[PDB]
Amino acid sequence: HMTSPFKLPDESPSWTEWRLHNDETQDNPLGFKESWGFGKVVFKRYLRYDRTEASLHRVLGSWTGDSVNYAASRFFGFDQIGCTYSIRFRGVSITVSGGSRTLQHLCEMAIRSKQEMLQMA
Amino acid sequence: HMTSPFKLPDESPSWTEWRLHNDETQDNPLGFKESWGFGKVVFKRYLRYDRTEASLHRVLGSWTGDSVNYAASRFFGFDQIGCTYSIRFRGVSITVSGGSRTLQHLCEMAIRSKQEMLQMA
RNA sequence: CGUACGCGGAAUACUUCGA
RNA sequence: CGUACGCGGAAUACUUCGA
């Protein structure tokens, strides 16, 4: 059981729920997918999002600079390792990548990209 | 001679200039690298940037939604193609990717990521 | 700054198979 | 929504070679 950088559990819909949603509505999916990779390990999350202020606040809390650093530090070594944050929403994907030594900046760019991605008209 | 999505020419420093800059100063490079890829074709640019308002204004003009769409449309076909914008600055890289059908949104996210990247403390 | 290459990881696009 | 795979492209990290 590795330590995840996420503070909220995964919310992936079952194949059935996904199908039901499809027949009900795309630019209106159940949510978005985001991931954090440290070296050879990747952690993923699908989170429900409905474009409301309440929902945006909730999902922006899925990870923080501190939770990412704590999870990432477990994989640090003599040499620098590759770190990456990815988020996909409505057909568009943004990936922020860099070496572990720039993790702080990586997280700053990651959270900003996340907010902009979710607040896309 | 293919049509580039860029409106400013490349400014890659020679090996000599780069070396001279190194001995003079990293979080203070001569500039940043950005690229636009449409299908199997990629266009690249290294642009000088000194963190000033004047410089930021200048480099944000290297491409627009219109110049990207005109360059990208040359590669459109029956099926959708993969499009990508990448920018690297001070050890951090941001890549915005998606299918050609989302190019408009891709460009919106790309320009925002570019501005945030260049205005990183 | 740039060139060629290898490994790992990742992203996107198209296609297909499986629930 | 998810799984496995192939091709192309791309990104990052480490290493090395070449200017």
UniProtKB/Swiss-Prot annotation, chains A, B:
Quaternary structure note: Homodimer.
A single Gene Ontology CC term: virion component
Keyword GTP-binding carried by entry: no
Keywords: Host-virus interaction, Inhibition of host innate immune response by virus, RNA-binding, Suppressor of RNA silencing, Viral immunoevasion
Organism, as annotated: Tomato bushy stunt virus (strain Cherry)
Function: Acts as a suppressor of RNA-mediated gene silencing, also known as post-transcriptional gene silencing (PTGS), a mechanism of plant viral defense that limits the accumulation of viral RNAs. Binds to short interfering RNAs (siRNAs) with high affinity. Acts as a molecular caliper to specifically select siRNAs based on the length of the duplex region of the RNA.
One example GO MF annotation: RNA binding
GO biological process, one term: symbiont-mediated suppression of host innate immune response
Stated family: Belongs to the tombusviruses protein p19 family.
Range of the intact protein held here: 27 to 148 of 172
Protein name: RNA silencing suppressor p19
Source organism superkingdom: Viruses
Signal sequence, start to end: none
